[PDB]
């Protein structure tokens, strides 16, 4: 189905004169495969997947050099932004960068992203057309003018439409056993009387890939949507994910409530009830 | 306008001394590069620097030091000069890593085992042939600079005190007078063709101007005859009706 | 590391289309550059290319195929001023920008009326003989003994006229104008 490749970068200034922290991670769809950590003893781009280990030494050297270049760019950006916002050198701040490309199942270019944030707020982002920028405040406008004068959006367009898609296809082929797989959810429902007349039903879906999944509660044929305790999709640590959703129901009325499950690995949607 | 500058553009070193090539750039470029070009090949990467404060070692880093204390400067330091380091060094700079690099003016650097092997040129100008006039109605003058070391020469033609760029042709690179020697002196020739009417006019003043880059006023010499310093050697000839 | 071009030197006549090529090792390369270096100058940036395909800049054209690790440059209407060493630069991630050996391109001039001749010159210390007005197809030797230089092309500008030349000199009295290892046409005009 639809596929995507995205890179995430986090750089944190640490209060004092200490070497700032830098962590880079790479994902194909919902599977992590590369990482870099400035506090690690390797100081190289490391693999976190079986199929990415087959790449040659020139690949790892180039990735190491490029991720180091990202790290140094963020090193400069911390002080630069600190000066932009008149912040003190006694505090700790954070720069975040994310970029990648999404395809439309047929492995053709669909979307491209490059976003940049200082602390936890948006700073600047490349628009959909990959030729214009969105600046958040009046210093991000200075950065925006600088990047327009240097034609950054053109280079990022060339990467997002060209190299990103090529290597996304190459990654999808190498390790097709893992990336192009689909794990069906293993589900069950639990009933708990919170009091004498009280009840609540938890709908559990486990060990599914990809992470996109839909669990909803329906009462007497119509969806409730708002009356539920839905949690964020979480990883199990083995490449699969878990998700559950609870609903409050009166005792003896558990059969009014049904749980509907939708996932790629299920050719037909599923419906569960308190059996 | 903003650009990039190297300094010096020419320097001769006695083996063992230390020398630092300065490189600066105004145009807010993050990445900077130091390349070494030996004229038998293309230029190879000595060092690079992605940002201010960070440096990197490249294709040929053996024997060279660098520093990136700020954004504008990226000097290249040779601590112990050896004869094998004779080359032409180029500095570059670019906005971001991977973008287009813009080069400076270059630095012709020659390390010699003995400063007494440096020599200025002997420039002589040879007047055209009357038979060439009778057959072609065009006259060709031949400038010839001989017996110099090293290859740091720049020849030009000046007529009546004004440099000309038409009918001129200088040899691309000099020749070796005793090519078996690693310290062989060099020679260079050039041609200036102008109409026979122009040559027969006795008012015209032809001057071949050869710039030789050698030692400086801060270089010690201590020899009896003369030391080759950065100087201009000219040789002239005049027209005649005959 | 590992960037290699057509070694050269290559020769293309005036007004024709020339083609240079270049290959590299790193498949992940994403930016490529063509530079122009005249003898004694610094590399002047001609073009850059990043995306696969072709790119038009006046008389110059860049073509790039990452699938075969290939980049190339095409020059229309080869002018005598285009004679230079053309450098291929490939970025290997970060600041590791690697250049090839450089392809020396020689654009040959169109000779109007070839008139091979050899003459003698004079001054105040040596002896100089001049071979001139020959076609670009003629090659020049250097062995002999005595110093002999290479071929050079001068442009007379206003006359719409160019000429080939070569010089030999010595201080030996046994040296002469007709004394020429390379093949030289028999109609070489000699003074009389």
């Amino acid at each position: 189905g639809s596929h995507s490749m995205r890179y995430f970068f986090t750089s944190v200034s640490r209060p004092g004169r200490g070497e700032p922290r830098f962590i880079a991670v790479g994902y194909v769809d919902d599977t992590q495969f590369v990482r870099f950590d400035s506090d690690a003893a390797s100081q190289r781009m490391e693999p976190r997947a079986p199929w990415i280990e087959q790449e040659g030494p020139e690949y790892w050297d180039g990735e190491t050099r490029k991720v180091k270049a990202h790290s140094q760019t963020h090193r400069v950006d911390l002080g630069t932004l600190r000066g932009y916002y008149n912040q003190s050198e006694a505090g700790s701040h954070t720069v975040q960068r994310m970029y990648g490309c999404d395809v439309g199942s047929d492995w053709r270019f669909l979307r491209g992203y490059h976003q940049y944030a200082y602390d936890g707020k948006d700073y600047i982002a490349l628009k959909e057309d990959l030729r214009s920028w969105t600046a958040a405040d009046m210093a991000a406008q200075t950065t925006k003018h600088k990047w327009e004068a240097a034609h950054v959006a053109e280079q990022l367009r060339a990467y997002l439409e060209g190299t990103c898609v090529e290597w996304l296809r190459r990654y999808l082929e190498n390790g097709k056993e893992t990336l192009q797989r689909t794990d069906a959810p293993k589900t069950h429902m639990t009933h708990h009387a919170v009091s004498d007349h009280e009840a609540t039903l938890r709908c559990w879906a486990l060990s599914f890939y990809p992470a996109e999944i839909t669990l909803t509660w329906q009462r007497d044929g119509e969806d409730q949507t708002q009356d539920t305790e839905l949690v964020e999709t979480r990883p199990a640590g083995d490449g699969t994910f878990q998700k559950w959703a609870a609903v409050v129901v009166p005792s003896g009325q558990e059969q009014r409530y049904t749980c509907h499950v939708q996932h790629e690995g299920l050719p037909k949607p599923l419906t569960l009830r308190w059996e | 306008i903003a650009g990039i500058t190297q300094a010096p553009t020419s320097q001769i070193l006695a083996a063992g001394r230390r020398m630092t090539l300065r490189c600066t750039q105004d145009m807010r470029h993050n990445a900077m590069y130091w390349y070494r070009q030996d004229l038998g090949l293309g230029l190879r990467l000595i060092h690079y620097s992605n940002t201010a404060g960070t440096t990197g070692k490249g294709e040929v880093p053996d024997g060279y030091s660098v520093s990136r204390a700020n954004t504008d400067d990226f000097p290249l330091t040779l601590a112990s000069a050896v004869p094998s380091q004779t080359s032409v060094y180029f500095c570059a700079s670019s906005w971001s890593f991977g973008t287009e690099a813009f080069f400076g003016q270059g630095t012709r650097l020659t390390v010699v085992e003995d400063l007494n092997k440096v020599f200025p040129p002997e420039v002589a100008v040879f007047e055209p042939s009357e038979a060439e006039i009778s057959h072609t109605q065009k006259a060709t003058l031949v400038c010839l600079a001989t017996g110099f070391y090293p290859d740091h020469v720049e020849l030009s033609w000046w007529v009546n005190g004004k440099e000309v760029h038409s009918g001129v042709c200088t040899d691309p690179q000099p020749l070796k007078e005793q090519p078996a020697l690693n310290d062989s002196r060099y020679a260079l020739s050039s041609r200036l063709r102008v109409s026979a009417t122009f040559w027969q006019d006795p008012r015209n003043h032809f001057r071949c101007q050869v710039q030789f880059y050698g030692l400086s006023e801060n270089d010690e010499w201590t020899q009896d005859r003369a030391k080759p310093v950065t100087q201009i050697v000219s040789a002239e000839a005049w027209g005649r009706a005959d | 590391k590992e960037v290699e071009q057509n070694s050269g030197p290559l020769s293309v006549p005036e007004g024709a289309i020339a083609s240079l090529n270049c290959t590299y090792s790193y498949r992940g390369s994403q930016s490529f550059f063509w530079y122009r270096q005249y003898s004694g100058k610094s590399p002047e940036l001609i073009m850059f290319i990043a995306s696969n395909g072709d790119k038009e800049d006046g008389r110059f054209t860049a073509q790039l195929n990452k699938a075969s690790q290939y980049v190339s440059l095409l020059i229309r209407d080869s002018q005598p001023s285009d004679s230079a060493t053309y450098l291929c630069a490939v970025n290997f991630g970060g600041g590791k920008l690697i250049f090839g050996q450089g392809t020396e391109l020689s654009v040959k001039p169109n000779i109007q009326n070839p008139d091979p001749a050899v003459y003698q010159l004079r001054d105040s210390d040596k002896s100089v003989c001049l071979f001139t007005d020959f076609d670009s197809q003629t090659n020049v030797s250097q062995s002999k003994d005595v110093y002999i230089t290479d071929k050079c092309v001068l442009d007379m500008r206003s006359m719409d006229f160019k000429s080939n030349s070569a010089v030999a000199w010595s201080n030996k009295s046994d040296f002469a104008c007709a004394n020429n290892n390379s093949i030289i046409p028999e109609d070489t005009f000699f003074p009389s």
């Binding site: 490029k66 | 993050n30 | 994403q30």
Partner: peptide, 10 residues
């Protein structure tokens, strides 16, 4: 694969 171009300081 990482982007080798388009990473400029703010």
């Amino acid at each position: 694969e990482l982007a080798g171009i388009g990473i400029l300081t703010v």
